[PDB]
């Protein structure tokens, strides 16, 4: 990853269930996303980041400074509210996301155009993969 901007198009996932049902979410609607191939958006500019989250049903933004600790408004999700840290450590993206629910957060990291993906909830972890496009 030399600046992880870019566009990056769906490729794989696996276990998203799971994580959705550790976060407490219907049924109607994590069913739904089960049929997604939802695509990553990334602007960086040397400390502050912009990531999107973008699909069929609905899209998903949040802005913060890495090693800045901020408070999350998760609604578009599931609801909820973090206190959100983001770091930059073992060469790869790391998150945790203090709240109500344990083990919340995820991590980000690159090899070759591929762009992969793990969510953390409770118990349950999930995988997602992604290809640079722009």
């Given at each position: 990853?030399?600046n992880?901007?870019?566009?990056?198009?769906f490729?794989?996932?696996?276990?998203?269930?799971?994580?959705?049902?550790?976060?407490?979410?219907?049924l109607?609607?994590?069913?739904?996303?089960?049929?997604?191939?939802?695509d990553?958006?990334?602007?960086?500019?040397?400390?502050?980041?912009?990531?999107?989250?973008?699909?069929?049903?609905?899209?998903?933004?949040?802005?913060?400074?890495?090693?800045?600790?901020?408070?999350?408004?998760?609604?578009?999700?599931?609801?909820?509210?973090?206190q959100?840290?983001?770091?930059?450590?073992?060469?790869?993206?790391?998150?945790?996301?203090?709240?109500?629910?344990?083990?919340?957060?995820?991590?980000?990291?690159?090899?070759?155009?591929?762009?992969?993906?793990?969510?953390?909830?409770?118990?349950a972890?999930?995988?997602?993969?992604?290809?640079?496009?722009?």
């Amino acid at each position: 990853p030399p600046n992880l901007t870019g566009y990056y198009r769906f490729v794989s996932q696996k276990n998203m269930e799971d994580y959705l049902q550790a976060l407490n979410i219907s049924l109607a609607v994590r069913k739904i996303a089960l049929l997604l191939k939802p695509d990553k958006e990334i602007e960086h500019q040397g400390n502050h980041m912009t990531v999107r989250t973008l699909s069929t049903f609905r899209n998903y933004t949040v802005q913060f400074d890495v090693g800045v600790e901020f408070e999350e408004d998760l609604r578009s999700v599931d609801g909820r509210k973090c206190q959100t840290i983001v770091t930059w450590e073992e060469e790869h993206l790391v998150c945790v996301q203090k709240g109500e629910v344990p083990n919340r957060g995820w991590r980000h990291w690159l090899e070759g155009e591929m762009l992969y993906l793990e969510l953390t909830a409770r118990d349950a972890v999930c995988e997602q993969v992604f290809r640079k496009v722009h």
